[PDB]
Design a protein around this ligand. Structure first.
Ligand SMILES: Nc1nc2c(ncn2[C@@H]2O[C@H](COP(=O)(O)OP(=O)(O)O)[C@@H](O)[C@H]2O)c(=O)[nH]1
Ligand SMILES: Nc1nc2c(ncn2[C@@H]2O[C@H](COP(=O)(O)OP(=O)(O)O)[C@@H](O)[C@H]2O)c(=O)[nH]1
Lengths: 388, 308, 446, 440
């Protein structure tokens, strides 16, 4: 029994690594659905700007297929799709929209999916029709960040354009010079928003996901090596050092095979990785263990997504403002220097709106940081401190 | 399994046996921080020492099992306090090892406790000796201290007395170390080595090992005399810090140009030296008193102190 | 957005900089000195991106992207003959006229008014090779003439032709007060454009370059040409993230976006531990505290009374994230900043090049920092406090060829007036931003 | 813990030959520079790094730097240890000073060439990380050698502030012609006086006597003198080369010996059991400690009269008993006397026998050696010094070896000599004042 078990488990691990590309689909899932290798997502958004914002339904799916085509083409991940050996991987990608309403909620429901097949569909836990769709929850939760990034970049560029444009006025009415100061100061305001976003994002992608993925690959990988140290040692989070296994004799001649993983361990470890991601204090929604903090009484993800939506409205209004500056330049540069400037009235109105939203933002953020300091947990405490 | 070399590997970590090499390296690297950290170590923030040890351990031989399981740990209650858990802030650090698979039936946990305590004491002494040695190196090398015709009062009262008391302290410290290591430690390792010859009963081996360790612990030089040594260490620590300061302090005492300045500084320096010296005389006399009040350390430690 | 970069090489020193730079770059990706693949095709998988900088043909030769500038074909040809491949010979450019430094800025300016009429077209043809282009670059030393003139004309010519396109600059500042009869002229002229054309600028101080080089080089003290390779080492750490893609900052735009607030403040002081060249066993903790060290800078002229506005940090190597958390704690506890800020310093953890001649690293890292701090104008004060004393006297006021700008001495004198006003307004704004009420222009309205 | 050794002059390099010979066969190397152990995989029980540099192919390069003027004598050693010594470490002059010259021309040559000598020592320094100090091995009588030693001694001391220096010095037996060298000798002291941190002195009368006692059939045994010298140096560094509990750096050794740096001249003694008929007279540690106090064991022939001791530091190597050593101090504190203004300072440094020389182990065999600080050290000065108090005024043959940094400008020459002798007088009166109980 011992011999057969050893032999069969060994051959199974070997065939998984060598024929169906295990450990290439895992890294592929991290580099596609869990938001890593961001350049792919950047290129996707860039090539699908016209459609993610389409205010319509019954959308042409063919264009999205072309989109995934040229997306995997543009990113570094073309190095996969180019190679015959692992070309199979790229085939599994697909994109979806769920229509619960008319108004371009596709951007609010755009979903990237990866369909598996036997044998791998049995070993890896993915968007099973009767699962929890954890990948989908994570992917939406991070797609929010990505929407923020895209809009902020575009409009930052248009801003710097317009400030550079008005710089050539100083032989004219200094009221236009006022614009400069206001816009410049206004610009700082926008940055105070945007940077905050990135901060949280980094934490998410570098203290929640990545650490877990590194642990999963470490455990799944330890079986691969040969003894670089003859002590099968474990290093802990508390400095504990423990040697498991038997202290074997040193090849002693008194008188005259290592532990790899079967199928259940594979499915077990992948599920552990996923659930330990979603049991973190920055994702949990609906248990008894949704401990709320002082000064707010709300779930952390709920308040955070409120912050992010507020960020979205800020981007919209700043877009309007920069637009306003653009047509002001348009009417100024031409003949009508007796230009009606109720546009300036709109300018002041929108500044008032912006400053209102910004004061509300700082207030909510102060509530947020105080909430995390109330939490007392070391990593959340340090996140709170870093935000200052 | 080669029990002999594993015991020797343990000892070289926990008794210093033939490893003073290692202790010198460790102290010379980390003394600049270990000197000052032990005032407010409640908020640990000791990332640097842990990280540095982690790095240095990677360099060592992998064919030594024991060095691999070496961990740096801290705690709060001090050395005499942790001995108060045995029979009812200077260097409150710690080394421990979780002995491997249940072949460790040879090596208990109580033995590891006592080994920990012993290493703690050794590091205390070695730290103080390293300070004194750096001080000696400073007193005879920095040109600031060389005599180039200054004032007979300053030599009579500042530099010569400083040297005299420094040498006194160093002689005492080295004498303490000499007694301890020579007439305390070699007994146990020698018995343990001799019981490796003609081995007949495992239980006798275990009993002898623990007996040697306990016989190390029973010495009142760790239990009853220890507050004397800690007050000693306070005095010597403060004096050595003062001298390290003097290295740059002396710069403004000579041809600011004696300009109604540093005259009270000279007087205060004289008094500081005098008071520290007198304190140390009293403390050595009381150490004499307890030595005489009630182990070849007798007529071994007392030779360098008994005043002429 | 996020794609290909085109770099520009201004002058002879800059062209040396670029030669060393591309040495280091092609070393990182294991690229053959002649431009053919230095890797056996046994592996077909590749896990980094060279599309932003290079182009490829049916014969798997890497065509670089760059432009090499002067009127003297000596340095260009030296670089070319250094690598018998590794460059396209059709992307260089040389003029045919008189040669001089200094106020030949003006003639150099005229070079463009004579020659850019086709030069950018070269650029244009090249830019038509790709689809997604996100920005240019420039390497320069402010002090020299030909480079300064061509760089300023190029910046002006590009700022109005390719909108929504980023232009970064790399500029080094001299330490000698000798040529100040003409030197502090060109410098000031150059600033006039770096205030209206650059989208972000990094500043270097040759005095600190040589000081650090002598401090760290285990060979005795030698020339600056062997110190040049300490420039590219910084430009490796930038664009590291877009060469070995990872979680964040896979674009250049986002990089200065986390560096640069409102466009008036675009001067950046680099720094890092030059733990390499072309050891030191430091952990992450040591690196991220050594970057605080006042001895560690590439513009080391400031008094320890500074004010940071923005900080970027990076690390190359495998790192424990906990050390980053602790180090952010420590650094925030030790640095100063205006009270209108809510963000902080940022950290990106990069990927060490994997084709490198590697031994086991054992958590030994290579740090780096850019800082937008208040003290950059300090490196200016020497040239701030020199040219005007000569302007009262006008030494070398005639070294301008007429062109179509040097017809009236008043023309030149007005140029200098405008320039000094520009730089003075710059320093005014940097000082004003330090006070906690900078936002009053919009937060005290009725 | 790296140590850099400087050897100079004919005597210095003869010393180096024998010294590195004993050290090497103490560390299982042989004349080639490879391991003599049958298994390279097994770990070792010492650290040879403090004296030897290591490469990939397991060749050990002694970090020894040798100086000369006539390369013949320094050439013999590599013609005995092939491929052992690095030849770039030697330095050879051409047409320099006269045979047996006064130190002056050697000092001139040293001032001329110290630039490249300093570059050499710097490049050997760069080879390592943990540098502890230098060592200097030479005689004072030799002209070019002592001039070079003085010049480089100044160069090291002023360039290098944080590094210890230890020098070993050789003095001729009281004889006839050294009335020039002894003459010359005085100025040499000037440097060691101010620049040396610790130093131990050697005379040839007691060396010849030891030879007359140990080895049979003596004809000329200067080689035996070098034997004893190397014996002493290796014994001193034993406790550093084979680690033990306490002393693992050189500074820690001397720090017990030297009060204020006006008293740093040390006098050795050693057990009759040698290190090159040896089987006798090694009876016991009790015996070793006792017979250490025999004046006949001194490495400088002095007189015995109620000697006054400053610092006693002895080391016993081998398998020892606690009881013997205990009783030994028990009566030596009573017998040994020291000035009443300080306290007793007796230190023992039990060490290790080297487990790579196939020794002949007995159960209680030991050897021992001792360093001390004396008043009688000044006795070695007077023997030479008294001489030039009688002759220097005449100067007929004295000036002729042209003893000065300038030639024939004898005014500055007498200036140097007078300042030197008065500095020596300061030393002597200083040791007397430490003697004369005046601070009591
Ligand atoms: N860092 C560095 N700077 C240099 C070097 N050589 C020259 N420079 C600087 O470059 C400036 C000269 O620029 P130059 O090459 O004459 O400009 P060009 O005439 O337009 O090519 C001087 O101010 C120098 O300080 C070098 O090797 N390294
Ligand atoms: N150390 C040592 N010195 C010796 C020995 N035999 C003789 N000497 C002295 O060592 C000195 C070496 O002088 P040195 O300058 O090296 O000889 P030179 O090069 O010919 O001038 C001579 O004055 C000898 O008197 C010996 O065995 N050991």
């Amino acid at each position: 029994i011992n011999d057969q078990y050893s032999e069969i488990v060994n051959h199974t691990n070997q065939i998984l690594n060598q024929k169906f590309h295990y450990r290439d689909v895992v890294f592929a899932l991290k580099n596609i659905l869990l938001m890593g290798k961001s350049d792919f997502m950047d290129a996707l958004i860039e090539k699908a700007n016209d459609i993610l914002a389409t205010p319509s339904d019954s959308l042409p799916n063919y264009k999205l297929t072309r989109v995934l085509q040229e997306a995997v083409q543009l990113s570094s991940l073309r190095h996969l799709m180019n190679s015959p050996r692992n070309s199979s991987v790229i085939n599994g990608l697909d994109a979806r929209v769920l229509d619960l309403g008319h108004g371009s909620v596709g951007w609010d429901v755009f979903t990237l999916d990866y369909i598996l097949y036997p044998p791998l569909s049995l070993v890896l836990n993915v968007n099973r029709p009767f699962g929890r769709k954890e990948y989908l929850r994570i992917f939406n939760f991070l797609w929010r960040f990505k929407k923020n990034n895209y809009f902020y970049q575009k409009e930052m560029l248009k801003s710097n354009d317009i400030i550079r444009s008005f710089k050539k006025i100083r032989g004219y009415n200094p009221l236009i010079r006022d614009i400069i100061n206001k816009l410049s100061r206004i610009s700082i305001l926008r940055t105070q928003f945007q940077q905050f976003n990135s901060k949280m994002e980094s934490y998410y992608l570098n203290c929640i996901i990545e650490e877990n993925f590194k642990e999963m690959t470490r455990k799944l990988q330890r079986t691969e090596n040969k003894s670089q140290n003859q002590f099968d040692l474990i290093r802990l989070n508390n400095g504990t050092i423990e040697l498991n296994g038997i202290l074997t004799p040193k090849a002693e001649v008194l008188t005259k095979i290592e532990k790899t993983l079967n199928i259940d361990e594979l499915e077990s470890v992948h599920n552990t990785f996923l659930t330990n991601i979603l049991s973190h204090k920055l994702f949990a929604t609906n248990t008894s263990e949704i401990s709320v903090g002082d000064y707010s009484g709300q779930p952390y993800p709920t308040s955070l997504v409120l912050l992010l939506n507020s960020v979205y409205e800020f981007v919209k209004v700043y877009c309007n403002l920069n637009d306003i500056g653009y047509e002001i330049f348009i009417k100024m540069n031409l003949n009508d220097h007796e230009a009606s400037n109720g546009l300036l009235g709109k300018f002041n109105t929108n500044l008032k709106e912006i400053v209102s939203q910004y004061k509300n933002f700082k207030d909510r953020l102060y509530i947020f940081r105080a909430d995390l300091k109330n939490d007392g947990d070391e990593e959340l405490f340090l996140l709170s401190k870093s935000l200052r | 399994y080669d029990l002999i070399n594993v015991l020797k590997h343990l000892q070289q970590i926990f008794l210093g046996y033939q490893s003073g090499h290692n202790v010198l390296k460790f102290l010379t690297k980390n003394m600049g921080e270990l000197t000052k950290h032990y005032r407010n170590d409640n908020n640990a923030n000791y990332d640097k020492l842990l990280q540095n040890f982690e790095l240095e351990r990677q360099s060592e031989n992998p064919n030594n099992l024991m060095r691999q399981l070496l961990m740096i740990q801290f705690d709060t209650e001090t050395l005499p306090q942790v001995l108060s858990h045995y029979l009812q802030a200077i260097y409150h650090l710690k080394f421990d090892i979780n002995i491997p698979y249940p072949l460790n039936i040879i090596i208990s946990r109580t033995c590891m406790i006592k080994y920990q305590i012993i290493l703690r004491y050794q590091l205390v002494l070695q730290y103080h000796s390293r300070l004194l040695d750096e001080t000696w190196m400073d007193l005879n090398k920095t040109p600031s201290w060389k005599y180039r015709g200054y004032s007979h009062t300053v030599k009579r009262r500042i530099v010569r007395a400083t040297r005299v008391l420094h040498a006194k302290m160093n002689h005492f410290i080295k004498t303490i170390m000499e007694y301890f290591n020579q007439n305390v430690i070699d007994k146990e390792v020698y018995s343990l080595e001799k019981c490796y010859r003609n081995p007949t009963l495992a239980v006798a081996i275990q009993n002898e090992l623990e007996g040697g360790l306990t016989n190390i612990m029973t010495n009142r030089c760790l239990s009853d005399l220890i507050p004397l040594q800690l007050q000693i260490f306070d005095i010597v620590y403060k004096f050595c810090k003062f001298i390290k300061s003097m290295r740059a302090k002396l710069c403004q005492l000579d041809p600011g140009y004696q300009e109604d300045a540093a005259l009270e500084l000279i007087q205060k320096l004289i008094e500081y030296i005098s008071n520290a010296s007198s304190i140390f005389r009293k403390c050595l006399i009381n150490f004499t008193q307890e030595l005489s009040t009630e182990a070849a350390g007798i007529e071994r430690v007392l030779y360098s102190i008994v005043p002429p | 957005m996020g794609g290909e970069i085109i770099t520009l090489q201004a002058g002879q020193c800059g062209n040396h900089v670029g030669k060393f730079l591309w040495s280091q770059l092609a070393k990182e990706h294991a690229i053959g000195t002649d431009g053919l693949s230095q890797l056996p095709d046994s592996s077909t998988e590749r896990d980094d991106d060279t599309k932003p900088f290079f182009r490829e043909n049916s014969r798997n030769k890497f065509t670089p992207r760059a432009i090499m500038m002067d009127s003297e074909p000596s340095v260009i040809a030296d670089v070319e003959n250094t690598f018998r491949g590794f460059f396209d010979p059709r992307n260089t450019w040389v003029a045919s006229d008189g040669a001089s430094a200094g106020n030949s800025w003006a003639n150099g300016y005229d070079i463009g008014t004579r020659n850019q009429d086709d030069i950018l077209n070269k650029i244009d043809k090249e830019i038509d090779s790709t689809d997604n282009f996100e920005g240019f670059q420039l390497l320069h030393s402010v002090a020299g003439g030909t480079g300064s003139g061509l760089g300023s004309n190029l910046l002006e010519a590009l700022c109005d032709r390719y909108p929504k396109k980023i232009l970064t600059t790399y500029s080094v500042f001299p330490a000698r007060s000798s040529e100040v009869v003409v030197q502090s002229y060109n410098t000031i002229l150059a600033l006039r454009r770096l205030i209206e054309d650059s989208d972000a600028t990094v500043v270097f101080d040759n005095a600190s370059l040589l000081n650090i080089s002598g401090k760290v080089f285990r060979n005795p003290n030698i020339d600056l040409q062997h110190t040049n390779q300490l420039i590219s080492t910084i430009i490796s750490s930038v664009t590291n993230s877009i060469r070995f893609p990872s979680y964040m900052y896979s674009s250049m735009s986002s990089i200065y976006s986390t560096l640069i607030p409102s466009p008036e403040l675009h001067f950046l002081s680099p720094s890092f531990t030059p733990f390499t060249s072309d050891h030191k066993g430091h952990s992450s903790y040591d690196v991220m505290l050594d970057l605080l060290d006042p001895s560690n800078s590439l513009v080391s002229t400031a008094m320890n009374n500074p004010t940071y506005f923005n900080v970027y940090n990076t690390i190359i190597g495998n790192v424990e994230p906990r050390q980053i958390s602790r180090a952010m704690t420590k650094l925030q506890q030790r640095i100063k900043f205006p009270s209108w800020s809510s963000s902080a310093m940022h950290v990106n953890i990069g990927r060490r090049s994997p084709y490198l001649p590697l031994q086991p690293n054992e958590n030994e890292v290579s740090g780096m920092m850019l800082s937008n701090m208040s003290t950059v104008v300090n490196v200016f004060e020497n040239a701030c406090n020199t040219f005007d004393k000569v302007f009262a006297k006008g030494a070398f006021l005639n070294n301008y060829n007429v062109g179509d700008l040097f017809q009236s001495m008043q023309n030149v004198q007005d140029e200098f007036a405008e320039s000094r006003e520009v730089v003075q307004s710059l320093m005014e704004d940097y000082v004003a931003a330090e006070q906690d009420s900078y936002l009053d222009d919009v937060l005290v309205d009725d």
